Design a binder for these strands. Structure first.
Lengths: 155, 66, 95
RNA sequence: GCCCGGAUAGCUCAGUCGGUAGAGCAGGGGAUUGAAAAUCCCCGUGUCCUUGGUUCGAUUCCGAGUCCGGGCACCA
RNA sequence: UAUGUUCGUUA
RNA sequence: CGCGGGGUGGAGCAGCCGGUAGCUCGUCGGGCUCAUAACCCGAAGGUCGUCGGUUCAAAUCCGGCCCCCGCAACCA
RNA sequence: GACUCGUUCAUACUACAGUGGCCACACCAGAUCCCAUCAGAACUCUGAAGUUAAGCACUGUAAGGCUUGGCUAGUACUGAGGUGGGAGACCGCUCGGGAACACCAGGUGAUGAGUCAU
RNA sequence: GCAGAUGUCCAAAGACAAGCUCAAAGAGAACAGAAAUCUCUUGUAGACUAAAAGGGGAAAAGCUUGUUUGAUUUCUAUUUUCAGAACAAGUAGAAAACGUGAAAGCGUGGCCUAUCGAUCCUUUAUAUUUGCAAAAUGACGUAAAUUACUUACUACUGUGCAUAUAGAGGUGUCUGAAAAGUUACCACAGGGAUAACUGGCUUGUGGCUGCCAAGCGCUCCUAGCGACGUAGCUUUUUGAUCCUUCGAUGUCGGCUCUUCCUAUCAUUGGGACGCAGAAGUCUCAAAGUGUCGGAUUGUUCACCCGCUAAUAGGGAACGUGA
RNA sequence: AGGGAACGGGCUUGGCAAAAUCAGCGGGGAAAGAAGACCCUGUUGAGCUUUACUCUAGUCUGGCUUUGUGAAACGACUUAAGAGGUGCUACUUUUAAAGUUGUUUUAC
RNA sequence: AUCCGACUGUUUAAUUAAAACAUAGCAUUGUGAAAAGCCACAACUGGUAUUAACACAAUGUGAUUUCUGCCCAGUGCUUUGAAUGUCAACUUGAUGAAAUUCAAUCAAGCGCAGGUAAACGGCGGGAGUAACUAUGACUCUCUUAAGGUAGCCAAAUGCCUC
RNA sequence: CCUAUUAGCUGGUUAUUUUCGAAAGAUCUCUCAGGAUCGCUGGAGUUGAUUAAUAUAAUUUUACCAGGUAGAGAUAAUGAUUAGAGGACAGGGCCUUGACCUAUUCUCAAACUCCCAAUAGGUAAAAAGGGCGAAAUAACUCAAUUUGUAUUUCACUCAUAUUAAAUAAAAUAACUCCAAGUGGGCCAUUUUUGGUAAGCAGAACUGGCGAUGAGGGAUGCUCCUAACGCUUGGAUAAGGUGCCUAAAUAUUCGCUCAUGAGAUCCCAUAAAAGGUGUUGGUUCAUAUGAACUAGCCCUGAAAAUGGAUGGCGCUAAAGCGGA
RNA sequence: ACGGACCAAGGAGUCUAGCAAAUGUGCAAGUGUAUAUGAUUCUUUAAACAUUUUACGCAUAAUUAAUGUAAUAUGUCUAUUGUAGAUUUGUGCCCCACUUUGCAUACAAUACCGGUAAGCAA
RNA sequence: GAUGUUAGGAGGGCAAAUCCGCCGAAUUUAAGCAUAUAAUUAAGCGGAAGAAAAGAAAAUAACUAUGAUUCC
RNA sequence: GGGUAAUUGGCGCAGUUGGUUAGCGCGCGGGUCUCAUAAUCCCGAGGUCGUGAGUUCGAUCCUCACAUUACCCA
């Protein structure tokens, strides 16, 4: 019967304990460029430019940048298909995403690694190692600390 | 008389029958309502580039075809 | 709702500036018998058959949207500015 | 046969969301009168129906019984 | 020629 | 039970259309009369059923209780 | 030893104490002028007689709070399986995930740019 | 389903800026008191922010003041509902013109979440945009030439009406007909998607049986009872439901007739007693046998009269209408 | 008996089960009749009623016509003069009975 | 003996024969006539009517006996009015270049003022109060158009109610 | 006769095989027995793929986010809520009553929260791209005619011989067109609202029934195994092996005696309360006495045609718990 | 739950109009020769055959209520620009990385036409 | 005018497919219904011919103009 | 929506440029008591705002305010 804009947002759109008050002045210095990823985290202290309830905690790509606002493309699931939605928010409600930060650091690290390896003409495997079964280990423990365990009775 | 008001039963499997279709993600997107005074200047940039290229092409074609 | 009689606001015609405007209230005005719809209705109502068009008889709401007529004092032209609906509307009442 | 209500003087009736028990009439003494009515002063009289519990304590709050009285009722 | 009721019982 | 209407002095009723509570009868005192009425003069008495809420302010407006009244409780 | 602009936004706060000032911060002297009020209190302006009393800085407290670690506890809860147990409420087992309050202990800051003084 | 709210209100309760800090408490001051005003201290908001509730807010979003009308015109990309249509309500912007501030900026109504409306018709505003079907209407206007049907050039051209665009007049059944009853005289298409009767699940309600023991029983919890509590059984009541029957399962009672259950009224044989006897009460095994005549009422039930040994309680489609 | 669309002739598990016949009978075949008449639904009706919506015969009333011939009275218009206030002029009152029109009565 | 209907009579052919209908009696209403009342008809014309108020038409009640109370606020019906508001066509006037647009008036109706209940109908509530108790002749008060009168009653009308 | 009127309603709707194969949601609707529209489905066609790889994925891993449900708490706040303990305003007779304050204490919340899971959710993991430079272009931006930005052109080069993590009968893809039926659902597990409850009413996830047979559960639309062309062998699942009935009167170890034993999830009811029946355990008492505990058994345990662990029956089990 | 005692024969998505999609066929910036005409054809023939070098429909151009206006634009017979991409060309008649060309199509950018705004307007 | 069984003549009725006048519904559709539609239809009344009716502009157009009616 | 009327003392009520005036009501004093009977002053934004006007509630004007008719196409 009731489906207003901020319906159901009693807890999501509430500032955390001892975290009230406007955003820090440093938030306005955050650099944003076209095509970089961004998280939509609604800041309830700023009422204008507030995103819809659904997009809180969603990641998207910047498709538009205005003087105080950002347009971001967000995937939304609508029954049998996904679709891009162009959500327009103010900069307080948006934050640079770390979703690909490991990818960027990996790109730089592998750049230098394979540069030096190709310099020394070695064929190196650069992909991530998805660690699985560990090798055998010949490990010695002082018998003064091998503790025997028995299941415990009831009290 | 009284009927079933609502259900989402079978809706998810109907959705997955033809898959959860993804957006196509085309390389270019229309700039229609986006950043005027930037995309207009980009139009001017591209016009300058095209004219500078095309006058070289016309010069080379004319001097190679007499 | 209290609205003053004058207002320094943008003129949309014949002066593209902010000018003084006289604010008044718009009124409907009588339906003239020569209007095409009225002539068609009267000709249709002639004859046998009784009432030929619906006559609304429900009347749910109790207020009307207030329409201000703005008259630029330089650009002699007028303009229409609709306000939210209200029960009590006065032009230039006591402050 | 369940659903409610009252049991308070000798008779009839009121009681701070428990603590004191009270008016009228019957009732003796009076005050008035020549006398008596009427009127006015004061006496007296009760487990606040009967049991049980709650409580620091119950007429009051419960629970039950007793008497008497106000509203119950199933189909076709 | 407006209104103006009543007076307990007995001796 | 579904409502829709109302609770104001001892009694019957206005204000109850937020800011100073009224009318009558009643009661009290004093006159008039041998006395009693009637009459005259002057006083008192309303915690506005209860509990919360909005307003600066609620008997008044807003909900919930407690009573009272008036309708509906039909087809089988 | 200090200051200005910041970052983190309590390890940074709060209470009560102690210590300290070359310039420096300040309190402080004054109200003609700009300005300001009921009030030169504040604000604004003009000063440099005084002073670390306060702000400020540092430290203390079996201090409160905050923060970190431990322990609570593989406890509570929970994803998957079960022709598991039990009258049911509930409760195991198999493959997995895993708290909180409380309590105990340590700590009470760190830092970017620029500048002054020596 | 639960607790509520909306059809409004606001020239400020909108815009901007500045200054200030609120509720409350404590201490103190003539009248002055629990409350009047003033002073200090503490004060994370315990105030206020139009309204419901939930979010947000402290050199503010609150209070005071000052200046204002951005509650303005036009247009995009879009979010909510969603069909990813419309309205509506928002978000981020662009082009004008402004307001405020010293400025950076902020302002396209209300701190955010609600406060609303198609086609057709009407109405009034705008227009150097148009029309009214062979034409003209400002105007022979401005320049030249004559006894004219002369010639060239002019954004600005009659009443009325119609159009384009923009608001407004409203559909609250709010994606939007102009609409009172009755049928016990009734009709049709259907419906067991749906009531009234049986049956089914359930058992609040009705009925029956337990457990504990505060009390009653002169004393004595349990001979017989058993309050406050609490565990069950039955389907003999009534509800609840709507599963089966609406191309029909004849819907009360009585009469008649049979059979069944036992939770036994009497009869048989026992146990207990608050059991002397007599009568009686509790209780066990037991369903073999029997459980009546009448007045009133359609009645079931009831209630009286009377006999009896006793006049028990129930089922069988509320047993039983070819 | 069970389960089943929750009352089976059929299904499952049991009991059982021996030709053909006659006459009765009303337990069952949720027996037969017959697209339930009760109830609900249908944007299907009909009878009836009214201060339902929209109309309509009748009826009442006015206008025009039919519709002619005379008279009178009243009203109004036009015209000339005076009076009231009043800036060659503008508005109201009265005075004629002068030319014109409407109404009411009346005669044939 | 009670109920109902006075009676004789009539009726739902094929589920109701009655307490229903009729009735005499009673009462009310319209109408003095071919320009009337009631009614038929598309028109023309007609029925009542070969009629004339002791008549015709329209209703209600339902023999006799004895009665038939109060209310005209409501709704109907009905009566008077140039004092009378409103209203249509038309007519007249003003304006306009004309269409038009504006004004003004002696219809009926409604409204106003009356009448009418054997028209439709309607016809109250709280307290207190008498020298045991009970009751309330009496009093106070709110209220209506009037407050259910004479009668009659658990009635074919009373739920509670056996 | 108009008229074969109209019907959102009932009934019927005619050969075979083969292949694909639903919906009972949703939005609007004088809409609730209907319709349109979306979804689900078929047919047609193109573009792709056909290169064990890219696109891709009801999956994970790595990295990074968002959350306030379960739990927890009541001294963190709010709202409840039971008790006392210590102490400087009110009242009465140095005392007492309270209030109030401080630290405690018992118990709570769908519309409470300091804290906070599990599960579920999102984004990213390189070639039409990335990194690094130069040179152009612009009316944008900046103090900048060479600040920045974007674009364009040239360079240089970033794993690929295993593929910028894993796995993948991943191209059985993507897209377009036309169109059917459907738009009464119901059930199970887990969660969950109303209700005393219901084979009741309403929702969430997934799987089913429907639309679907086969083996088992005696029987049974939904339970278990398992989904189906026609066969021959083999071996199993679920479940069983005394007979009905194919297979054990198997083996091995306990328990149980019932004058209403018990006997396969759903599943075809049983409780509080009891027992000096028997079998094991536990803790106190000088093999004795107690008090507990929990297995099986017994009481509690009454319904109507005659009756049902499915039947027979079974007790050195053919019952119960194992192996 | 309803219909069906039995058997035979009959018995139900068709016809026309109009629109679209699909596919086949002809022709193609055209296409269809409408009504009608002619012509040694006049059983069939009511069909076939034919059409003296602007009939009409649809298409070839859109847009606006409308007066109307109407698609790069003469530097060039050229045929807008990108990113992918079929095919083609070379060098390493048959695998492969760079070259060359760049269909269809997709995503965008540009011009230009009509309308509306805005600015100017003899 | 009236009257004539004066003389000579005509009309009447049937039949209807096409045709000419009149009169005139509702079902139906609108998913209801009232305007509208059905339909200037069915039914009803009258009147003709081998065809009938229409027809020689008080017509179009707006052109470089056409030229009775009917039909395709 | 159109036409008309109306709202001036607490009550009732007509009156328009050299203008607010009144009967009942309040109060007091008057007439053996009470009844009924003269009196002084108190009581008015002439409903509300504005406008024309030496000389106006006054003449017009809009606003809402009540009562009659009559009118209804989003």
């Amino acid at each position: 019967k009731s489906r207003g804009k901020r319906s159901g947002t009693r807890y999501k759109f509430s500032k955390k304990f001892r975290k009230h008050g406007e955003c820090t002045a440093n938030k306005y210095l955050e650099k944003l460029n076209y095509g970089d990823y961004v998280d939509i985290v609604c800041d309830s202290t700023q009422q204008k430019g507030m995103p819809f309830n659904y997009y809180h905690g969603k990641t998207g790509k910047i498709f538009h940048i205005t003087k105080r606002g950002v347009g971001v493309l967000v995937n939304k699931r609508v029954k049998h298909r996904i679709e891009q939605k162009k959500v327009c928010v103010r900069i307080e409600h948006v934050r640079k995403s770390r979703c690909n930060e490991d990818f960027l650091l990996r790109k730089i690290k592998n750049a230098e690694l394979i540069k030096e390896a190709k310099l020394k003409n070695e064929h190196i495997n650069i992909k991530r190692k998805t660690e699985g079964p560990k090798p055998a280990a010949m490990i010695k423990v002082p018998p003064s600390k091998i503790i025997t365990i028995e299941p415990l009775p009831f009290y | 008389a009284k009927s079933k008001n609502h259900t989402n039963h079978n809706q998810n499997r109907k959705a997955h029958k033809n898959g959860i279709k993804k957006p196509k993600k085309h390389k270019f997107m229309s700039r229609k309502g986006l950043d005027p005074n930037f995309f207009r200047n980009q139009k001017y940039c591209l016009k300058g580039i095209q004219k500078k290229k095309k006058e070289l092409k016309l010069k080379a074609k004319q001097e190679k075809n007499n | 709702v209290n609205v003053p009689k004058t207002r320094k606001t943008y003129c949309s015609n014949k002066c593209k500036k902010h000018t003084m405007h006289k604010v008044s209230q718009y009124k409907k005005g009588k339906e003239r018998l020569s209007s095409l719809g009225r002539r068609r209705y009267d000709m249709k109502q002639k004859g046998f058959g009784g009432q030929t068009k619906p006559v609304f008889k429900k009347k749910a709401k109790t207020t009307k949207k207030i329409v201000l007529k703005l008259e630029c004092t330089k650009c002699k032209k007028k303009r229409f500015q609709t306000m939210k609906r209200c029960k009590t509307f006065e032009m230039g009442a006591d402050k």
